RNA sequence: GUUAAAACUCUUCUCAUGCUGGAUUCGAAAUUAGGUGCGCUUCGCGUUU
C-alpha cells in the first residue's frame, strides 16, 4: 500500500490555521495553536498492489475504502478532519 | 530473491472575544366646490256704531 502522494504542492493545498481552546464559562480562547491542513478538493494518489489475487481482494479494498470515506483519512478525525471521497481503478498486469 | 516481515505521529482542544449602517436632507411645488335655478303661489283692514 503505498503512500497516498498528493498530486499538488505545499504552496497550492497547505494552509496553517488558528485552532482554538474556548473556556466555558467566559466564552473565550484559553489556548490558542496553529496547526498545518490540506485543502478540500485536494487530490492525492496511491498504487495499491496485491499479489497472488484471490477473488474477494478489490471487493475488500473498496469495501475499506467505503470504511475510510465515513470515519475518515490521518488524524484530528473526531472534530470533522478527513472525511474524503475516493475514486477507484482496477488493473491485472500478464506480460512485460 | 532488500539485517527482511510486522506497527496509520495517534489521542485531547469550536478563530473566539471587543465594535448598533450611522450621520446630512420637510412629499411639496401648481389648481377659488365653482357653474345653473326670483320665497313664490292663494286670501280687498272686513264688520260694527
Known amino acids: ?4 502522494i498528493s498530486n499538488d504542492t505545499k504552496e497550492q493545498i497547505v ?3 488558528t485552532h482554538l481552546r474556548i473556556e466555558r464559562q467566559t466564552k473565550s480562547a484559553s489556548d490558542t495553536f496553529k496547526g498545518e491542513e490540506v ?4 487530490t492525492f494518489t496511491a498504487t ?9 481482494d478489490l471487493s475488500l479494498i473498496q469495501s475499506a475504502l467505503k470504511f475510510i ?3 475518515g483519512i490521518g488524524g484530528w ?3 470533522g478532519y478527513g ?3 475516493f475514486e477507484v481503478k482496477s488493473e491485472d498486469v500478464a506480460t512485460d
Do not use: H, M, Y
Open 1 to 4: 500500500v503505498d503512500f497516498l
Open 15 to 17: 494552509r496553517e490555521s
Open 39 to 42: 485543502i478540500e478538493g485536494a
Open 48 to 56: 495499491i498492489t496485491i499479489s497472488n489475487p484471490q477473488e474477494k
Open 69 to 71: 470515506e465515513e470515519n
Open 77 to 79: 478525525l473526531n472534530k
Open 83 to 85: 472525511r474524503v471521497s
